[PDB]
């Protein structure tokens, strides 16, 4: 029985990628050492981190006026780095935030340590929709505007780029990075933790417009300052060498599988398969997210009713584990069930979940 | 062949790399990779808790000391230790002992968060440790910071300095677990894993549990000691594979005799090279005073104290021809540098010893 | 490393070729090969019944439809369809729609068994589908025949044509189970397995149960639907191994999302190649109208519409160096033809996409 | 341990299955399966040519005969033989020699294309070949048909009959290449390959090259001898894998001594069983007159001429317990039947003979 | 791959054996082997003088001591020590400390040359060192003898016992040059080279120069200290090759850090094994008391203190299967004995440590 890994982050990696890492784990391409032993200042690793940046630029069509850097600290680290580097862009130290789920809320709260944060929309009773941009109250003197493209815990995803009336746009794409093409010119800063969609945990990719450097605060750590790191080509200090090497192998895998354009159509096929089972389930599976904001990456749902049948949800997760389908348990803050369908999750995998969901419904529906 | 004298990231034990390779696709039968593993799983809980217990056992860490695993490397703590501690006393003052390039870098970084005073008079050359008595200590300084092993200049403390009861913060990146350490006398110990205990990506921090909460407002949450300690280093996704790698290297250190056996091997390896430099009749020149000579990093010059560039080039070329990697000195000092961390075996240093002996035998006048 | 763009026989899933190899000497532990298995044994009964069940499941074939497995390939049904159905009405007439080479061959073969009226005027170039509303249908015709996907000219139906209540017959040889089909609207569907759902030697035929018993006297017993449906495809020895191979391919299609997912995967594959042609600025020429372009077979020319023989040879030569087999166009059209059947993965097509993009960038004037 | 006495499909040489298994993913280094191989490729031309040459070599087929490989099995030829040859003379009549189940099936099928006349009186039991002197031959008949070996009743011709110079069509399916054959005496020879030369899916048809061009109008083009001979059996996609398998079995026959050695081996094998029957003192009864006994299929009963069902079941149940498969007689006859085709080794017949001897020793009253 | 745990002769450094091999036919260009070198040549004089200088340098032998190389092994000094020194006092009495089989064998041999008195009561088992204050010393005895490291029983002295001024003779064959030695406090130190400093054939004796000339009349000239020291160990033909071999081992010990490094390596190696024995839950049983445990020879039992014969046999069988040689204990004690001399590297000990850990995990209940 082969394992089906629906991991939410860290998540599943392509099997062929794990085969290459295992192959050259003790003698990387004849150099004689491992990537785990490789000096970050050698020519050998210089090609690895340069090829990784070249892949990020190619796959996302990143314009030449954007800097691509690899930092540590994960996504939650960028929750501090974005205000540290950008909240001083305008004297008021004001920043606008769009809270559509748990991770955009966690980021807005963290930004209050560095400036006056304002949520541009009236609070949502439940993270089940994106507030209409026509209802946003945007500060014209705000340094930037922040929003989260894909909410991992709640399954709410933007399928558009919001109009911030010309403001500096900041976006958190950790749970949908390189699942679809992006017009990078519309953004000021894009960041994404690699552990979810483009590699393994340890490294965070950040795409910064080159004219936004140099507004960092005095309290910004040098290792998180965009100007410092973009000047040293992500090599101000020792970067997560192995995680940048793993990321390049996952990026090379996306390119060989059709790039961002193909990942979007595949993400449609996978998410549709599950969403159709839910909508036709006659209430047996309950996804409260509204259809136009449903995420193609994370599909959280309940069983039985809108509040969730705990016994039925316990049998579901237990029968799914004996079938070697891991990490289907929803986030501990919402409970229920969460199916994550990142790039590495194959169509045959979603089919296994889809068949199990149809067989489980035929067996417990009333 | 291949003998890796890397400064950091450095060589890993060949036994460790073999196990990482064996279970990269199916970690101990669970069915997934550690690269694929979730930090909120019970499987990674065993990994990160086993790594913590090894840090506590091998270093004899008291139970009133938190052990957290952060990101950002060494230079991350250059910003993390002031953000977490410079506000311990209202002055926002800190005493810094600059014995080399890494203590100077941390001293410069701390200037972003308060008043930073360098304790001694500025040295002309990082070749000696300013005697602890000539230290201009501030009684109201929030903490005193020094670097146990200066990787670029080869100046290592073989003692714990006296700071008149101040909380002591030490940077042991390039000598972590190379010798037993009295953790009780320290307030905060940090070390980047890539030099002597793991691979690049994760940093060990040992903090006395009564120094949390003095964090400035601008301290990022992933680097705030109080936050990460209260979440067992799981406030956000930690460098899972790096923590798993370190757990195996710590396991290797334990099986070979712990911190007690590492120190004895550190002396054998370091003295083997130092005997060659001292008996070299001026062919090899190491400027460090013998009492402060590092046992991990040995920088020296060839030909003269200023360095014979043409001679040092044939050295590094012939050394590369013999598959001895990363012997080139740091770019700010030049010359040669031999890094003899835990994974570097006695067999390795003997190869470097026989090579330096013959090279001197063929180029000295 | 080989990328198989074969047009029929075509590529099989690597998963399927592996299980066929493992079980070649001892199928499921019964002691013998499938090649040695008797068509009367209880073991082959499970094989052919499962292969019948999968066809009914993956296409949603209603209960009033028979599913049989014949020999003779697709061209066998060019004679078996008239022999079985041209006598539905006493006139011995049949309406045929000639959109390419394979419907043209079927129309000429049917003239041996009756009077055949082609429903539309000659096209001059197989580049479009004549409008079904302009179709000259005979209300006394026994059936209406049409080829859903023309493997040589790349002309595919993206709809079911209205034949005004006439018994409808379709040649789905080259797009069988590449998309869902409303079987209720058809009278007879047939498809050679060697193009999309297995290996050569067997032909699947789907017949409405009231269309049996209209076969002419001259129809062979092994090709009479009524005879073969009455014996469950076992009137004589069936292609046992070829039916077994089909069952594994169908089981592979079911495990990958059924026909619904094949249609969307075929959209990704064909859109990737067709866009390279449209943006080629005349370097790649596909004369088929976009509304009728095939998602399975993409024939095109290089250089200009009539074809540059020099560029088309280097394309096929460099494609052969890269192990991209069977990309040469059919003998009657020449040029290039890429076949993107079910087993052809997205990763395969990307190798073709990168090669066509690089060839254009290197020879475009 | 399994001993396969299958009637058809039958056992294949273990060395053939071993080679098919190892080349199944990468046939002779070309990079693809034969199941994926195009029938128009250089590789398959070499396969189908080698299969034809071995047929011509082992049977010594004269140059004025076409060797074509068809689909539809032997029952397919039951229609292809009349469709191609019943119009040879204007009367459209054919004379048929019914010696068992497969002659009667073929004679009845032929009645769908012309007037068929059995040349001999209806035999009360298929136990003897009517003396060729008794044959009532029509001098205006288009051909004379007879079955060489009746697989169900065990009646075999050990001579080429005299048909007064008429064109002779023979159904050698169950004794093809079990002995040399004077091909020059025949007009059409056909044989399903699943009994003694390969796997199910392909039929070998040897036609004298002047009998081409007499096919009826209703003959399917895939079954027309003239069409297929002009296309080297490549008018449409042929059963590629079956022909590849058939070639390997032909190579195995050639390496084991050709048709001459098969006749010597088939004599030793059938004698081993008949000797048990002839000396069984009525315990085993074989109704066929010994001068017409088949050397390939040995049907018999246990107990008495009509057969004791209680004893025959215990025989088959114990035989199945010993892993001896397909010993049950045909459904229309019941009882026991042993098929001893070329792949059935001498040790296989030795296991059966030792079992029959012990079974006779345990139940003979 | 072979790991040599021999008790004596033991393993030699792989580098030393390589040099012996390379220059076996042409010792440093001279044109002859060492095996052919005349002991009276200028070439061999350089060799034996080199070996003597290395012994003085590594052990810090004061100038008032003679260093001589003799034949006869260690047992040769069991006779040579009484013959040379028992006449130092007219009583012909000598004190012998019996801690194991080698001091016991040395005490018996000493009775041939005088009245020998064992200083303590016979132990029930050679598991500890009798307390030095419990020693019954003869003030009129010529000398006091003891064995520093008992190879058979694993009892080792970690001190220089106070003999109240008497001249002290010590048997250091099992730990010679495994640690710094205060040579001044002894009268005669001897050690067979075949255990920790070379190959069999030669024995080193360190004699204080004021103790020469007390040899009895029956002392052979080749074994008299005054004779050999008077001819620089060249009274007769000395074991030329065994001295040359020994000189390379000494050169190897010097390049690896002298005796101070051999002391640290012995601590790491012995403790790695002892930690497994103390934590074995009685699975491994070392009978020696912790304060007298040898660091060169570790004897233990498996299963219980008396030893499970079947369990220890499967231990030695899998040890041989893993190419770990000479682990079987001495015949008088049985069980397992692991020898950890200077040439036995840490990797060798780690190999054994992992094997002992896995042998326990698969046999312990
Ligand atoms: C003592 C000490 N402190 C901090 C660091 C850096 O850790 P990082 O901040 O994780 O890179 C290091 C790493 N030493 C390395 C740094 O080299 P680099 O200049 O970064 O290429 C070396 O000596 O070559 C260190 O030795
Ligand atoms: C749509 C459609 N219908 C019928 C056939 C005939 O298959 P067969 O009769 O089994 O060969 C085919 C076979 N097509 C193949 C035929 O190749 P061929 O021209 O036979 O070498 C092709 O397109 O190249 C088909 O594509």
Residue numbers in the entry:
A (entry chain E): 5 to 370
B (entry chain F), C (entry chain D), D (entry chain C), E (entry chain G): 6 to 370
Sentences from the paper on this structure:
Phosphoserine aminotransferase (PSAT) catalyzes the intermediate step, the pyridoxal 5′‐phosphate‐dependent transamination of 3‐phosphohydroxypyruvate and L‐glutamate to O‐phosphoserine (OPS) and α‐ketoglutarate. Human PSAT (EC 2.6.1.52) is a pyridoxal 5′‐phosphate (PLP)‐dependent enzyme whose coding gene is located on the long arm of chromosome 9. The 3D X‐ray crystal structure of PSAT was solved in the substrate‐free as well as in the OPS‐bound forms.
The best crystal diffracted to 2.78 Å resolution, preserving the same cell parameters and space group with eight chains per asymmetric unit. Due to the very short soaking time, we could capture subsequent steps of the OPS reaction, observing differences between the catalytic sites of the eight chains. In chains D and F, the OPS‐PLP external aldimine is present, while in chain E the geminal diamine formed by Lys200, PLP, and OPS could be modeled. In the other two chains (G and H) not enough density was present to model OPS. On the contrary, we could well fit the sulfate anion, which indeed occupies the phosphate binding site of the substrate, near the internal aldimine adduct in both chains. In the OPS‐soaked structure, in all the sites where OPS is found, the sulfate atom is replaced by the phosphate group of OPS that forms salt‐bridges with His44*, Arg45*, His335, and with Arg336.
